[PDB]
Amino acid sequence: RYHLRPPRRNDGAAIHQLVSECPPLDLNSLYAYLLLCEHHAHTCVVAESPGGRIDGFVSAYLLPTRPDVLFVWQVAVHSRARGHRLGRAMLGHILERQECRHVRHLETTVGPDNQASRRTFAGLAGERGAHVSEQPFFDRQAFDEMLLRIGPF
Amino acid sequence: RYHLRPPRRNDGAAIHQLVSECPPLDLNSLYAYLLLCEHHAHTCVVAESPGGRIDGFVSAYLLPTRPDVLFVWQVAVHSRARGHRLGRAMLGHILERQECRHVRHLETTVGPDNQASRRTFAGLAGERGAHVSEQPFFDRQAFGGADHDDEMLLRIGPF
């Protein structure tokens, strides 16, 4: 029932509002979401209802120093959109794009703002014969948030 | 005096605190700065005192679909660090790097009244024989009516 497509500039306000309505995700500035629409649309996705509401969003980008790794920043799915495995559908949709043809690995972090994320990434990994590992994100000089590595594809 | 270097992962908290103390820059989450430090260090810079205090930061990255364009996201210069022309020094430092040796254009956005910020980018262009252009970009439509000034697109180049 959702149409998945890359985001466009006119989606930025709505994506910022969706993220706000999906606590505990960190709410970045509206301008940051607009930059995702402007510069990263080919590696991001929105899920748009029949009536035009944006009920899902994924922000992601290839790592500049490791271009076979897709790094997933935030996954937002509105309560009204639960029970469609939308987070997994959105990640799969990104990975099937031409810009992602050489992606071997996925990385994201899981901590206070996105524990519900783990099921989404394990689902993706499961659908693609890949496996989820985890490692502490921070080193011992800093200041549990974990880097998840999902692979291979 | 300050020295300039790429940020390291553990600079995230200090860079986040620096932006919080430079209103009216838009503050993003801590994690957004951690990700700049972790994924974009080769195109960002901090200005650091001999004592290790960060009073300047620039975030920038090459555009994934237009890799000869460097986009500058935020230029933070603490009030205690005025009069050092840190913004221009920091931008120059990034542009000088081996990672930016193929950059032909620099893009950034500026609000309506931000004249000093325009002069920084103008000065940079002049020292490279580059053109500066400014076009409407993010307006009320793009912000969904939120209480935020318009951001025009400032574009310098070709270098």
Q: How far is CA B116 from CA A39, B25, B88, B135, B138, in A?
A: 26, 14, 11, 17, 20
CATH class as words, domain A1-153: alpha beta
* Contact with chain B for residue A43, Cβ under 8 A: yes
How far is the CA of B155 from the CAs of A92, B104, B159, in angstroms?
35, 11, 11
Kindly list the domain boundaries of chain A, sorted by start residue.
1-153
Q: Is the dihedral of CA B56, B14, B9, A150 positive or negative?
A: negative
Q: In chain A, whose CA is at the least distance from the CA of B13?
A: A143
**Beta-sheet pairing, B45-48 with B105-110:** unpaired
Q: How was this structure determined?
A: X-ray
Resolution in A: 1.9
Nearest CA to B107 among B141, B145, B147, B158? B158
Contact (CB, 8 A) for B149 and B112: yes
For the domain with range B1-159, which CATH number is right: 3.40.630.30, 3.40.50.2300, 3.40.640.10, 3.10.310.70? Answer: 3.40.630.30
Closest to B32 (Cβ–Cβ): which among A28, A43, A141? A28
**Probe site for chain A from B17, B26, B29 (most A CB atoms < 10 A):** B29
